[PDB]
Structure 1
Amino acid sequence: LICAQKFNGLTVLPPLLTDEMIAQYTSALLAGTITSGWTFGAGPALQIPFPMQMAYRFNGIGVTQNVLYENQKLIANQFNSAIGKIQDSLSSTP
């Protein structure tokens, strides 16, 4: 059983990075992505308004800059609905 892991000379070493500092790393990465786009991954983090960073990423896939700005509310609603659905997607299928 996992409750008593000692068994017979069977040591289970704990991970060096506990879940708390791993989550701190993930949160720092999230904040970097949100408030600095790709800039923080290649040097100092340069703040850039989110919608503008989204337009930049749109420019990277082919769609021009103005596609996002004229559809900002629609894209925001789509993103928020999808991120809402992902939790129920994980829950529904074990």
Structure 2
Amino acid sequence: SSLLGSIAGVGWTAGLSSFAAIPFAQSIFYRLNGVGITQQVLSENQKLIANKFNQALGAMQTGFTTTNEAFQKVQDAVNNNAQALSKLASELSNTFGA
């Protein structure tokens, strides 16, 4: 959560880390000014982008299951170590020997 706090000001940069407190909107107009190198006249006229950014994050809210790995990678991890731990320990005991 302090990392989400430092998203805006640290994403500026101008050095990591000796900075800052800049609002998140202006952080995405400079982060957007940077590599999507659309300069200031497009982000001025217009924004909403904001509704497209929020629309993007909205579909990022709705979509976890099931066809959206990364998420199947996450349950591949929890099912990985839970499988190894509990299921391999269930093979180890009951039964192995002669």
Q: Where on the TM-score scale, by shorter chain, does this alignment land: which range?
A: 0.5 to 0.7
- 1:66 alignment partner, one of 32, 36, 41: 41
Q: Which has the higher contact order (CA 8 A, sep 6+)?
A: 2
Paired residues, number: 67
What's the TM-score once normalised by structure 2's chain length? 0.53
Distance 1:37 1:65 in 2: 18
3-state SS in 1 of match to 2:33: helix
Corresponding residue of 1:42: 16
Distance 1:30 1:41 in 2: 17
Percent of paired sites with the same residue: 37
Q: 5+ unaligned residues in a row in structure 1: which ranges?
A: 1-26
Runs of 4+ in 1 over 4 A off after TM superposition: none
RMSD of aligned alpha carbons: 2.3
Distance 2:15 2:65 in 1: 32
What's the TM-score once normalised by structure 1's chain length? 0.55
Query: If you compute each CA radius of gyration, which structure gives the higher value, 1 or 2?
Result: 2
